[PDB]
């Protein structure tokens, strides 16, 4: 049983109805009792209770509840009383009935519900409202989106059976040609296959597609479709692979950033409470920093929160384990292409650049707009050229002039862009260790993200600018395991070769025991090897490395390793995650925000931009646009590149 709420052992329906009656007795009601009851009984038992109540009093429990309660807390409780099928119908009703139209709800339900659930859905709609669901849907949606929805409404998807490897491969190429190989996508094609083929078949098709293409099916869909259809087709895929994972992220999305999408939270927590709530939790914790319980506890309040925490629940299983494993498989096989946001300027004229720069700095005030239009629109290399030119033209150091004429975050941003990669990092590391305390966050981000070549370049740039070895510096500002671990990474001496299934299983065993060598493995093994090592870990312990690190490590030590693991799993994502935090909350960390924007502006910033929008449903553009302002915002948005 992967549900969070199960049948209450030895339950007295008649008494429960009596307790519900007495709970609402007098002015108001004993909400603490109502929630503890309803939330401690299966939807089936709730139906019996609601039944005994109708006879024992001749009143409607749901109608009565609707009166004695109010607010989100009411929607939740009343929603928990409605039969599964009739609950879905209500959600759909609200979505297509009113002012706007919740396509998010339409997609969540229609793309996840099974053939039976779908049939029980449309039936409950016609019964509860005496209206045709297909007609209502068809008349409230347009385009391929409407089509796909109607196809999903038929609930006539071929159900699991023996897979025909011949048809699987035929579908793999069919999809490939209908999408990846073309400018756009054959909607009619994807709708038919992704909508008719069995989940078991498609799952094997998706696996085949990645192994023979290099990228997951969604990678070929993303950006190749438009509007709600893209989202819908991306949701169907996710659901086919794992509905637990779908709701896992769908949930995270409803609580992400100030303000909650309570309507989605209640719908999901209620609908999956007796299906895969447990797996969703196992996946949520693994896929995200905070646990479902923690996220809900911090986003909701009152009885509404207490109820949600009860619905939630608070080793892996066939599902939660599959996802974790497949997560590493993808990261290991996926053929990703790193792309920056700022590219070399065409018709590059250093002489004209240095002139415009010199001009925009003369006088009392400093023309910053021009300074930004140039600097932020030139590759770090071209920038180094403007420095050379500027100097060999005016006999003055551009940096010194820039540093003096500029100030604040802007000065830090602009001057940061003018510094060569290896030197910017060196400066960063030096600052993190200067003064009182250590910017543990800065050191980790860098030392746990940079490569052997990058670390080598850094180690050198450091000795120069700051006559002292990067190690010596580290030993001066840090200590303990944090220092040992950091110093290790600062050696840029990690294995480069491919994976070794032999050593892998061995290394994996080391991680299993912990639940010095571990450090060596996480600091010495090549990323491709570690990727496999983690594959073997989930296969022999049933847990994910992240869980071993969290359970046996804490604080900085735990953050360096998690940073490393994340860097090996999905570097761009790790940065998108860090970029979100910097702008998360009332304040803003222009420091981290600036460091990441600059450092990755020419490596994989575009990649980060996508991982950001996909996971937080909002472009980095708007993300920055809302936090920063003035000239700091102008320059930043320049690096973002759209
Ligand atoms: Ca009310
Ligand atoms: Ca395509
Ligand atoms: Ca929130
Ligand atoms: Ca000036
Ligand atoms: Ca310090
Ligand atoms: Ca902020």
Between CA 627 and CA 582 the distance in angstroms is: 10
Q: Where are the beta strands (DSSP E) in 24-146?
A: none
Question: H or E element: which one contains 320?
Answer: helix 318-333
Between CA 7 and CA 309 the distance in angstroms is: 18
Task: Please tell me the number of the ligand nearest to residue 221's CA.
Answer: 2
List the determination method: X-ray
Please check whether residue 629 is in contact with residue 590, taking contact to mean a CB–CB distance below 8 angstroms: no
Please check whether residue 516 is in contact with residue 508, taking contact to mean a CB–CB distance below 8 angstroms: no
Q: Within 10 Å of residue 195's Cβ, how many Cβ atoms?
A: 20
Task: Please tell me the number of the ligand nearest to residue 474's CA.
Answer: 5
Closest CA to 424 of 442, 408, 407, 438: 442
Q: Cα(45) to centroid of ligand 1, in Å?
A: 24
Q: Within 10 Å of residue 432's Cβ, how many Cβ atoms?
A: 24
Residues 6+ apart with CB under 8 A from 108: 235, 250, 264, 267, 268
Q: Cα(407) to centroid of ligand 4, in Å?
A: 11
CATH code, 496-570: 1.10.220.10
Q: Which residue reads 């009166």 in tokens?
A: 67
Q: Cα(358) to centroid of ligand 4, in Å?
A: 10
Per the rule left: phi > 0, alpha: psi between -120 and 50, beta: everything else, 641 is left
CB-count burial class (<10 Å; 0-12, 13-18, 19+) for 20: buried
**Resolution of the experimental structure, in angstroms:** 2.9
Q: Cα(488) to centroid of ligand 4, in Å?
A: 45
Task: Please tell me the number of the ligand nearest to residue 257's CA.
Answer: 3
Class of domain 571-642: mainly alpha
Q: What is the dihedral of CA 565, 570, 574, 579, to 10 degrees?
A: 170
Q: Within 10 Å of residue 143's Cβ, how many Cβ atoms?
A: 12
Q: Cα(473) to centroid of ligand 5, in Å?
A: 10
* DSSP string for 220-267: HHTTSS-HHHHHHHHHHHHHHH-HHHHHHHHHHHHHSSSS--HHHHHH
CB-count burial class (<10 Å; 0-12, 13-18, 19+) for 512: middle
Task: Please tell me the number of the ligand nearest to residue 63's CA.
Answer: 1
Q: Cα(415) to centroid of ligand 4, in Å?
A: 16
Between CA 3 and CA 1 the distance in angstroms is: 6
Q: Cα(361) to centroid of ligand 4, in Å?
A: 5
Topology alike, domains 160-242 and 496-570: yes
Q: Cα(369) to centroid of ligand 4, in Å?
A: 13
Please check whether residue 222 is in contact with residue 230, taking contact to mean a CB–CB distance below 8 angstroms: yes
Between CA 311 and CA 266 the distance in angstroms is: 10
Please check whether residue 46 is in contact with residue 10, taking contact to mean a CB–CB distance below 8 angstroms: no
CATH code, 82-159: 1.10.220.10
Its sign, for the CA torsion 406, 412, 417, 419, is positive
Q: List b or e across 444-460, with b for residues whose CB sees 16 or more CB atoms inside 10 angstroms.
A: bbbbbbbeeebbebbbe
Q: Cα(4) to centroid of ligand 1, in Å?
A: 28
Q: Cα(131) to centroid of ligand 1, in Å?
A: 26
Q: Around ion ligand 5, which residues have CB less than 5 A away?
A: 433, 435, 477
Residue 354 tokens, joined: 């240095």
CA 608 to chain centre: 11
Please check whether residue 490 is in contact with residue 425, taking contact to mean a CB–CB distance below 8 angstroms: no
The verdict on domain 348-421 having CATH code 1.10.220.10 is yes
Residue 401 tokens, joined: 């002039």
Residue 306 tokens, joined: 């207490």
Class of domain 160-242: mainly alpha
Please check whether residue 239 is in contact with residue 112, taking contact to mean a CB–CB distance below 8 angstroms: yes
CB-count burial class (<10 Å; 0-12, 13-18, 19+) for 605: buried
SS (H, E, C) 386-421: HHHHHHHHHCCCHHHHHHHHCCHHHHHHHHHHHCCH
Task: Please tell me the number of the ligand nearest to residue 185's CA.
Answer: 2
Between CA 569 and CA 177 the distance in angstroms is: 29
Q: Cα(168) to centroid of ligand 2, in Å?
A: 20
Q: Around ion ligand 6, which residues have CB less than 5 A away?
A: 588, 627
Q: Of 1.10.220.10, 3.40.50.720, 3.40.50.150, 3.40.720.10, which CATH number belongs to 2-81? A: 1.10.220.10
Between CA 154 and CA 134 the distance in angstroms is: 9
Between CA 589 and CA 584 the distance in angstroms is: 9
Q: Cα(588) to centroid of ligand 3, in Å?
A: 17
Between CA 642 and CA 621 the distance in angstroms is: 7
Task: Please tell me the number of the ligand nearest to residue 68's CA.
Answer: 1
Q: Within 10 Å of residue 120's Cβ, how many Cβ atoms?
A: 19
Please check whether residue 99 is in contact with residue 66, taking contact to mean a CB–CB distance below 8 angstroms: no
Task: Please tell me the number of the ligand nearest to residue 65's CA.
Answer: 1
Its sign, for the CA torsion 11, 312, 283, 240, is positive
Question: H or E element: which one contains 351?
Answer: helix 350-359
Q: Phi then psi for 443, rounded to 5 degrees? A: -55, -50
Q: Cα(219) to centroid of ligand 2, in Å?
A: 9
Closest CA to 458 of 499, 495, 486: 486
Task: Please tell me the number of the ligand nearest to residue 585's CA.
Answer: 6
Q: Cα(433) to centroid of ligand 5, in Å?
A: 4
Q: Cα(569) to centroid of ligand 3, in Å?
A: 27
Residue 224 DSSP symbol: S
Q: List b or e across 247-263, with b for residues whose CB sees 16 or more CB atoms inside 10 angstroms.
A: bbbbbbbbbbeeebbbb
Helix axes 292-299, 262-271, angle to 10 degrees: 140
Q: Cα(265) to centroid of ligand 4, in Å?
A: 54
Task: Please tell me the number of the ligand nearest to residue 75's CA.
Answer: 1
CATH code, 243-314: 1.10.220.10
Q: Cα(289) to centroid of ligand 5, in Å?
A: 28
Task: Please tell me the number of the ligand nearest to residue 429's CA.
Answer: 5
Q: Cα(602) to centroid of ligand 1, in Å?
A: 56
* Topology (CATH level 3) of domain 422-495: Annexin V; domain 1 (1.10.220)
CA 35 to chain centre: 32
Domain map (residue ranges) of the chain: 2-81, 82-159, 160-242, 243-314, 348-421, 422-495, 496-570, 571-642
Q: Cα(367) to centroid of ligand 2, in Å?
A: 44
Q: What is the dihedral of CA 485, 491, 497, 502, to 10 degrees?
A: -30
Please check whether residue 225 is in contact with residue 189, taking contact to mean a CB–CB distance below 8 angstroms: no
Q: Cα(255) to centroid of ligand 3, in Å?
A: 4
Task: Please tell me the number of the ligand nearest to residue 296's CA.
Answer: 3
Q: Cα(478) to centroid of ligand 5, in Å?
A: 8
Q: Which residue reads 């011949």 in tokens?
A: 166
Between CA 622 and CA 607 the distance in angstroms is: 17
Task: Please tell me the number of the ligand nearest to residue 219's CA.
Answer: 2
What angle (nearest 5°) sits at the alpha carbon of residue 261, between those of residues 260 and 266? 110
Give, rounded to a whole angstrom, the gap between the first and last alpha carbons of the chain.
Answer: 47
Residue 112 tokens, joined: 């996840």
Residue 629 tokens, joined: 């302002």
Q: Cα(619) to centroid of ligand 6, in Å?
A: 15
Between CA 569 and CA 571 the distance in angstroms is: 7
Please check whether residue 134 is in contact with residue 146, taking contact to mean a CB–CB distance below 8 angstroms: no
Q: Cα(352) to centroid of ligand 4, in Å?
A: 19
Closest CA to 123 of 147, 98, 81, 153: 153
Task: Please tell me the number of the ligand nearest to residue 628's CA.
Answer: 6
Between CA 285 and CA 550 the distance in angstroms is: 11
Q: Which residue reads 């551009």 in tokens?
A: 398
Please check whether residue 320 is in contact with residue 284, taking contact to mean a CB–CB distance below 8 angstroms: no
Per the rule left: phi > 0, alpha: psi between -120 and 50, beta: everything else, 146 is alpha
Task: Please tell me the number of the ligand nearest to residue 72's CA.
Answer: 1
Between CA 525 and CA 536 the distance in angstroms is: 15
Q: Cα(394) to centroid of ligand 4, in Å?
A: 17
Residues 6+ apart with CB under 8 A from 404: none
Q: Where are the beta strands (DSSP E) in 111-190?
A: none
Q: List b or e across 617-633, with b for residues whose CB sees 16 or more CB atoms inside 10 angstroms.
A: eeebbebbeebbeebbb
Around 264, how many Cα atoms within 13 Å sit in the side-chain half-sphere?
22
Task: Please tell me the number of the ligand nearest to residue 371's CA.
Answer: 4
* CA diameter of the chain: 96
Residue 533 tokens, joined: 């090592």
Per the rule left: phi > 0, alpha: psi between -120 and 50, beta: everything else, 630 is left
Q: Cα(405) to centroid of ligand 4, in Å?
A: 6
Q: Phi then psi for 597, rounded to 5 degrees? A: -60, -40
Q: What is the dihedral of CA 206, 615, 76, 90, to 10 degrees?
A: -50
């Amino acid at each position: 049983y992967r549900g969070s709420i199960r049948d209450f052992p030895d339950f007295n329906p008649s008494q429960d109805a009596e307790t519900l009656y007495n709970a609402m007795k007098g002015f108001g009601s004993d909400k603490e009792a109502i929630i503890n009851l309803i939330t401690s009984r299966s939807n089936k038992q709730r139906q019996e209770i609601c039944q005994n109540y109708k006879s024992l009093y001749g009143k409607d429990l749901i109608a009565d509840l609707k009166y004695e309660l109010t607010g989100k807390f009411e929607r939740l409780i009343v929603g928990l009383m409605r039969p599964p099928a009739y609950a879905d119908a209500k959600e759909i009703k609200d979505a297509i009935s009113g002012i706007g139209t919740d396509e998010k709800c339409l997609i969540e339900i229609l793309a996840s519900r099974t053939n039976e659930q779908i049939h029980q859905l449309v039936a409950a709609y016609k019964d509860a409202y005496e209206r045709d669901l297909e007609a209502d849907i068809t008349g409230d949606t347009s385009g391929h989106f409407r089509k796909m929805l109607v196809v999903l409404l038929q609930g006539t998807r071929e159900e699991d059976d023996v897979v025909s490897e011949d048809l699987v491969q035929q579908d793999v190429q069919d999809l490939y040609e209908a999408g990846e190989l073309k400018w756009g996508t054959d909607e009619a094609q994807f709708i038919y296959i992704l909508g008719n083929r069995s989940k078991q078949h498609l799952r094997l098709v998706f696996d085949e597609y990645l192994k023979t293409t290099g990228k997951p099916i969604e990678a070929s869909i993303r950006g190749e479709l438009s509007g709600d259809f893209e989202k819908l087709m991306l949701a169907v895929v996710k659901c086919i692979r794992s509905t637990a994972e779908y709701f896992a992220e769908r949930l995270f999305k409803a609580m992400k950033g100030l303000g909650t999408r309570d309507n989605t939270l209640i719908r999901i927590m209620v609908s999956r409470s007796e299906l895969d709530m447990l797996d969703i939790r196992e996946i949520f914790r693994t896929k995200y920093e905070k646990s479902l319980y923690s996220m809900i506890k911090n986003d909701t309040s009152g009885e509404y929160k207490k109820t949600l925490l009860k619905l939630c629940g608070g080793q892996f299983f066939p599902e939660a384990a599959q996802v974790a494993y497949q997560m590493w498989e993808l990261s290991a096989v996926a053929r990703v292409e790193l792309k920056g946001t700022v590219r070399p300027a065409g018709d590059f004229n250093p002489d004209a650049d240095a002139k415009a720069l010199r001009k925009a700095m003369k006088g009392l005030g400093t023309d910053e707009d021009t300074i930004i239009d140039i600097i932020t629109h030139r590759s770090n290399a071209q920038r180094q050229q403007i420095r050379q030119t500027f100097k060999s033209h005016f006999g003055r150091d551009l940096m010194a002039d820039l540093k003096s004429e500029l100030s604040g975050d802007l000065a830090r941003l602009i001057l940061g862009l003018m510094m060569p990669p290896a030197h910017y990092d060196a400066k960063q590391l030096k600052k993190a260790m200067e003064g009182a305390g250590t910017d543990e966050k800065a050191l980790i981000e860098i030392l746990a993200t940079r490569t052997n070549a990058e670390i080598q370049a850094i180690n050198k740039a450091y000795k120069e600018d700051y006559h002292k070895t990067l190690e010596d510096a580290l030993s001066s500002d840090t200590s303990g395991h944090f220092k040992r671990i950091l110093i290790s990474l600062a050696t840029g001496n990690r294995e480069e070769g491919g994976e070794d299934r032999e050593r892998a299983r061995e290394d994996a065993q080391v991680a299993a025991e912990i639940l010095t060598r571990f450090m060596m493995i996480l600091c010495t093994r090549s990323y491709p090897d570690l990727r496999r090592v983690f594959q073997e870990f989930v296969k022999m312990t049933n847990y994910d490395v992240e869980h071993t690190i969290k359970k046996e490590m804490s604080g900085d030590v735990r953050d360096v390793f998690v940073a490393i693991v994340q860097s090996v799993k999905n570097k761009p994502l790790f940065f998108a995650d860090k970029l979100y935090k910097s702008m998360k909350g009332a304040g803003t960390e222009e420091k981290t925000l600036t460091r990441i924007m600059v450092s990755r502006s020419e490596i994989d910033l575009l990649n980060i931009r996508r991982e950001f929008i996909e996971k937080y449903d909002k472009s980095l553009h708007q993300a920055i646009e809302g936090d920063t302002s003035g000239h700091f915002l102008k320059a930043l948005l320049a690096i973002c590149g759209g």
